[PDB]
């Protein structure tokens, strides 16, 4: 086509989706990770995670307002990945890298798994 | 903070949101523009348009599944802007620029209004 493109559009959309999340506006699911609860937008979760894409395209699970993750999933690891989904920024640290990598593998977030593997290989 | 950032993340999220829209997955509103209907995600509309941000933060309108736009709004102009919201790409042509600019003004999409004004000024 003969379209023009606004370079910052995708980043501005994501910034606004994060603002809606922070104000709990039109959030339609709560992700339960052991004792912790995280409110989010199903569409953002699906757009970022192979696991959520699978869950919310399921004819029964698409209608659930609460999703309980595997008890082995670390809440801090999930929190870091949820922030990444809404911002493109990953708070990767020596003290959380193993939890973040395990959570990204479970959530099926390949690019996060890739950078965790690379940061781990560099420290060995 | 000491975060790392994935450059393509925002663009990949938007690409997936557009794929969900094309398959009518978790769309929660229909925008009626005279004889035409457009299915969309309320959160994407709010993240792109000052008018939709206002509508879906309203305590009554947030719950509506159908939104009827002003009868002066051109369906093709709306279609072009809806595509822009989900892709960052604007199909701006001599034959549609006036309709696109009027629709962007109504929807409160300042960056689109700005490029339409610039393209018009160049042709005079």
């Amino acid at each position: 086509d003969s379209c023009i493109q606004f370079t910052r559009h995708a980043s501005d959309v994501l910034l606004n989706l994060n603002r809606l999340r922070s104000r709990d506006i039109l959030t339609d699911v709560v992700i339960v990770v052991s004792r912790e609860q995280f409110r989010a937008h199903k569409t953002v979760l699906m757009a970022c995670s192979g696991l959520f894409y699978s869950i919310f395209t399921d004819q029964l699970k698409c209608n659930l307002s609460v999703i309980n993750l595997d008890p082995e999933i670390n809440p801090e690891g999930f929190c870091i990945l949820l922030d990444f989904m809404y911002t493109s920024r990953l708070n990767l640290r020596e003290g959380n890298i193993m939890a973040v990598m395990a959570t990204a593998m479970y959530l099926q977030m390949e690019h996060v798994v890739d950078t965790c593997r690379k940061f781990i290989k560099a420290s060995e | 903070d000491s975060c790392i950032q994935f450059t393509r993340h925002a663009s990949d999220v938007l690409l997936n949101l557009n794929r969900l829209r094309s398959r009518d997955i978790l769309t929660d509103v229909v925008i009626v523009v005279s004889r035409e209907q457009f299915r969309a995600h309320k959160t994407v509309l709010m993240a792109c348009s000052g008018l939709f941000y206002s509508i879906f933060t309203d305590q009554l309108k947030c719950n509506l599944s159908v939104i009827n736009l002003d009868p002066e709004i051109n369906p093709e102009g709306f279609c072009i802007l809806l595509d822009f919201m989900y892709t960052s790409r604007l199909n701006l042509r001599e034959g549609n620029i006036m309709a696109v600019m009027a629709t962007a003004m109504y929807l409160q999409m300042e960056h689109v209004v700005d490029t339409c004004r610039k393209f018009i000024k160049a042709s005079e």
Partner: peptide, 4 residues
Amino acid sequence: WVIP
């Protein structure tokens, strides 16, 4: 705005 750019030519993509």
